[PDB]
Design a binder for this molecule. Sequence first.
Ligand code: ROC
Ligand code: CL
Ligand code: CL
Ligand code: CL
Ligand code: NA
Ligand code: NA
Lengths: 99, 99
Amino acid sequence: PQITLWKRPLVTIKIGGQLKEALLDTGADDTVIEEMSLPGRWKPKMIGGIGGFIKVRQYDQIIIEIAGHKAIGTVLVGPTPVNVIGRNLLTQIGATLNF
Amino acid sequence: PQITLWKRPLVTIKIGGQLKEALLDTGADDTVIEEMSLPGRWKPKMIGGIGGFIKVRQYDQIIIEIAGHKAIGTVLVGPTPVNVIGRNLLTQIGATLNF
Ligand SMILES: CC(C)(C)NC(=O)[C@@H]1C[C@@H]2CCCC[C@@H]2CN1C[C@@H](O)[C@H](Cc1ccccc1)NC(=O)[C@H](CC(N)=O)NC(=O)c1ccc2ccccc2n1
Ligand SMILES: [Cl-]
Ligand SMILES: [Cl-]
Ligand SMILES: [Cl-]
Ligand code: NA
Ligand code: NA
C-alpha cells in the first residue's frame, strides 16, 4: 500500500497468535512493543526516546506479521504507550518513504 | 525521491535562516527542533514519547524547507537530541510510506 500521513500510520500486527496495533515509524531504529510474553531468552538494552532512556527486554528472531507481511527479527519489550515498528522490521517488509 | 530505510532518513532542512539536518519521522505527530530562536509568539507545551515528556515552545506558522520542499506549520522547540520532522509537515510535502 501507499499510506498518507494525515493520520497516524497504524497497522495491525500479529505476534504470538495475537493481533495488536502498531505504528510504522521511520524515525525509530528499533521496534518496541508493550509488555507481553515472548519465547526464549532476552538480553538487556537501553533505548532513548524523546523523554529519556528506558530499559527494555531484547528478544531476537521473533516472528511478527506486519500489515500482512512477514518479518522475523528483533523485538524490544518495554513500557511504551504505542507499539512502534522501526526500521529494523520496516526494511524486512520493503517499506520506503516517498515524496 | 524514494528513501530506503536501511539508514536513518536524514535530510537537509532550512529553518529560521539556518541549514540543519533532520529526521523524516512518520511516528511523530509533531515537528520538534533542537533549541534555537524563532520569530513571533509562542506558548508552552508538553509532548511525550518513550521515556516520558519534555517541555517545548510551540511556534505556529513557521516555514521550513525540507529537502527542497517548502512547508508551513507548527514547530516545537526544545530539548530534543535530534531534529524531527513529524507528520504535520510530512503531509505538506506529499510524503507517503510505501510497501
Ligand atoms: C522508539 C524508539 C526506538 C525509542 N525511538 C524513538 O522514540 C526515536 C527517538 C529519537 C530521539 C529523541 C527525539 C525523538 C526521536 C525519534 N523517535 C521516534 C519517534 O517516531 C517517536 C516514536 C514514538 C511514537 C509514539 C509513542 C512513543 C514513541 N515519536 C515520538 O516520540 C512522538 C513525539 C511527539 N510528536 O510528540 N510521539 C508521538 O507522536 C506520540 C503519539 C501518541 C502518544 C500517546 C501517548 C503518549 C505519547 C504519545 N506520543
Ligand atoms: Cl532485526
Ligand atoms: Cl501544523
Ligand atoms: Cl495527500
Ligand atoms: Na529469541
Ligand atoms: Na507564529
